[PDB]
Assembly symmetry: D2
Homo-oligomer: 33 residues x 4
């Protein structure tokens, strides 16, 4: 299975941007299986 | 400022998002 | 709405940003 | 040299987010040469 990694992000706005991207990529993951 | 953490699935995805993240940090630093 | 264009240098970078872009579109569509 | 590609982006906020990312990546390009 996938290994998980943690990224340190500077700034709330940047965090929210990268979090939204990550959440979207994970939704794509869910449709693949 | 306290920094945030984001947990990412997959090495390639992590490396991509890390590259983006660090490039954004560089852009801030180069502006001054 | 009129959509925007962004010009990107490099196939790998383009594919990465396109994947992100389309995943965001999917997230919108799945919310309703 | 690099080939350029155009991406169609839906929504101004998303455009600004991806544009900022792209601009940052290109700045990194400039420091490599």
């Amino acid at each position: 299975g996938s290994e998980y990694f943690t990224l340190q992000i500077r700034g709330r706005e940047r965090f929210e941007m990268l979090r939204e991207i990550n959440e979207a990529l994970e939704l794509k993951d869910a449709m693949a299986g």
